[PDB]
Design a protein that fits this description.
123 residues; 40% helix; monomer; mainly alpha; binds calcium ion; two-stranded antiparallel ribbon; lipid metabolism
């Protein structure tokens, strides 16, 4: 979950401190999400939100109250690449992949310092 996701982002964007730079970005980067994403970074977050939401409709994820933000999985970072571990059971493997996709997206889009701390009246 989170602790793991923060590391995935640091794996790809080494200079970052994720919970500081990507927290409260746009309408999607943070808890919840509503409106239209303000940019590509925000669209990344929207997508991940939809993935988590999707992890929910899976029989494999039904029995894990811990929640994906805190549903712990195994992965690795070796020379800036993320690898989800085969040892992850069905649900965690799916959440892992959602987080890998997002950390990769984040590293491929521009950061607009105009959208952090964005007021939720724009969503
Ligand atoms: Ca979100």
């Amino acid at each position: 979950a989170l602790w793991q996701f923060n590391g995935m982002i640091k794996c790809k964007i080494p200079s970052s401190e994720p919970l500081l730079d990507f927290n409260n970005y746009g309408c999607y980067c943070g808890l919840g999400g509503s409106g239209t994403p303000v940019d590509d970074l925000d669209r990344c977050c929207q997508t991940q939100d939809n993935c988590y939401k999707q992890a929910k409709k899976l029989d494999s994820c039904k029995v894990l109250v811990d929640n994906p933000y805190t549903n712990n999985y195994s992965y690795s970072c070796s020379n800036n690449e993320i690898t989800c571990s085969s040892e992850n059971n069905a649900c965690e493997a799916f959440i892992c992949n959602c987080d890998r996709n997002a950390a990769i997206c984040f590293s491929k889009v521009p950061y607009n310092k105009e959208h952090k701390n964005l007021d939720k009246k724009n969503c």
